[PDB]
Design a binder for this molecule. Sequence first.
Ligand SMILES: Nc1ncnc2c1ncn2[C@@H]1O[C@H](COP(=O)(O)OC(=O)[C@@H](N)Cc2c[nH]c3ccccc23)[C@@H](O)[C@H]1O
Ligand SMILES: CC#CC(=O)N1CC[C@@H](n2c(=O)n(-c3ccc(Oc4ccccc4)cc3)c3c(N)ncnc32)C1
Ligand SMILES: O=c1[nH]c2cc(Cl)ccc2o1
Lengths: 333, 323
Amino acid sequence: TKPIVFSGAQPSGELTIGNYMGALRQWVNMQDDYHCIYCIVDQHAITVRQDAQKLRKATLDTLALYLACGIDPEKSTIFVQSHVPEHAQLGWALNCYTYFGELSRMTQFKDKSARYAENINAGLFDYPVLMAADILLYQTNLVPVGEDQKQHLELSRDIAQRFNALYGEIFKVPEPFIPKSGARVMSLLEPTKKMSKSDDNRNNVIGLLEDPKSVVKKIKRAVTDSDEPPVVRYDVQNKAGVSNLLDILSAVTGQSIPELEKQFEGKMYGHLKGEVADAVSGMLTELQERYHRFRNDEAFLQQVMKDGAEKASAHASRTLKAVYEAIGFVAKR
Amino acid sequence: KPIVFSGAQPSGELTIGNYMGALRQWVNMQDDYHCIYCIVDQHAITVRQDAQKLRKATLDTLALYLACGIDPEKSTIFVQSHVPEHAQLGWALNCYTYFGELSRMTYAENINAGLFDYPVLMAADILLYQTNLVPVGEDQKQHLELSRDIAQRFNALYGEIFKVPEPFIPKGARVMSLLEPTKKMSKSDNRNNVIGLLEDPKSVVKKIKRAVTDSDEPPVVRYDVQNKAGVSNLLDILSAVTGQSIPELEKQFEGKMYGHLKGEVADAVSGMLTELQERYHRFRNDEAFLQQVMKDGAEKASAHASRTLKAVYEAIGFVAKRH
Ligand SMILES: Nc1ncnc2c1ncn2[C@@H]1O[C@H](COP(=O)(O)OC(=O)[C@@H](N)Cc2c[nH]c3ccccc23)[C@@H](O)[C@H]1O
Ligand SMILES: CC#CC(=O)N1CC[C@@H](n2c(=O)n(-c3ccc(Oc4ccccc4)cc3)c3c(N)ncnc32)C1
Ligand SMILES: O=c1[nH]c2cc(Cl)ccc2o1
């Protein structure tokens, strides 16, 4: 049997080129090499307060976006997290092998709490324990994520090791798969602030389902530097805007930074921004064409969800049964 | 008919204070209310324990509740972990519970997240069954109020999805500690202060013989909680078992010493525990019966739990499961 890949994306906000380059792109490429399981984590999404209609719609948007990106329901398991009770079940049990200190220190909790001060709920605190359960249920070997999720994974490895130490080899210990380019794509007007899918300012983001023409305009208006002469070079501390653009260019084309720097020799930010704009505009136009064919076919989405959940439940139930046996619960008949 | 929900923790040996003081009451109200008894193994794992002891103690708890007279045909009795809706609703309710409310209940970096988050599970356990009444002790009054606040908050956003649970106000027997007659007899205790429902006649005698009395000269068997705590407890225990009034017993032991009282108390108690113990060992040593009660209970629980969770999930706006 192949090693298992597991990842998730929240059905909240609007997925960006950041979400694509740091996660989805890898998801699509791993599908034959490994046994891949992709999850729409609607249970994680409600740690920030959602309009009920927005959540339902955004869950089906996320599904259609996965399919449009090239996730193949014939190769991978695609499912919605809340359709598999084993996630919440393992999550509770895994709370009892997770320390408060491990949860208090989490950066996402801190950053989330400050932004939604009027909704610092216990789910937001306990977010990482559900995310561990998500991963450990499927005997996962690899987890393809962006750099912002590194510490959440690390806790899951500690949990898995902690549990195994007491009870034997119930879990596999997962390992991160973070891309070489575009693991943390930066905001257009704030190149020191990560690109957010729920940013107040849309001018910071390249949205995957945004009008391409609006994206070319955002790229032209992206912040650069006062360098005289203007030079296209990777200098993150001194050239964050230009660099982030060069990295976007790299990961869309597959080209190297050294190659790009060479290609833009004797040229300025006009040549740069024109090239990033052509690359990304062509990608979004193709993706969006696929997206609409999928998103408007409810019967197809419904089938994918149904088959997905069945496959996941077969894996999930097997793992939970052994967890429950280990911890000493009377087994259900 | 009001829905009553009780959590019975698979651990802890039940005392005579539990049986004649609480359970015996509720056995006799199973036609008055739709009573639900949930063995809460998911709550138990907040404290690390031996897995095989937890499994055994779950079945020990079930057998004893059946032996105390909980009828699986009138009441719903089941194991918490057999109904996934508990953990499912638990997570969803985490997202409507302030972190502050969990920290407001009784260094801390070394406690497991279970010990911190379990009141949300308690809220879910109760709210799943549209519960009207929750019989709670004072240790768990703060927890019920959190359950009430959570239900109201959710309801105000989404409509009347939950019933707002109420405490069961009415309390009737006072069973106090044998060597500390001011403290109520509790399983959580010096086992010389308590009498377990599975204790033998010989152990009962030894514990009652040690029970504190007073230095009154001559010894006088009269009820007086302030001045004669030990003797008063012995009288209350005897009354609870036999149904004889205190005044009747005060006459029955006129001109008698505390040894006579102690001897009669031990006979009465051991007399009561015997038919309980008979049913217990008979139920406990019948796997298929226990397995059948558990199967039936969980099916009944899941039928009702599933309708609440489905309405909660629709309100929140999750895409419904296809299956
Ligand atoms: N600007 C950015 N540049 C590069 N990568 C980025 C950028 N912003 C986001 N990402 C990555 O995109 C994925 C989706 O993030 P979400 O917020 O939906 O989703 C999250 O943040 C997860 N908690 C969802 C989750 C829940 N359970 C799981 C189990 C395994 C893996 C993942 C999950 C992520 O991989 C994230 O790292
Ligand atoms: C603040 C304070 C206080 C206080 O004085 N104490 C003493 C007992 C301490 N404490 C619990 O009460 N529980 C617990 C166990 C089972 C349970 O089941 C139900 C479910 C629904 C309805 C009734 C009972 C509910 C709670 C604890 C736990 N799981 N894990 C640890 N401690 C638990 C709280
Ligand atoms: O990860 C988690 N935490 C949880 C807390 C409750 Cl009450 C239920 C399920 C959970 O899953």
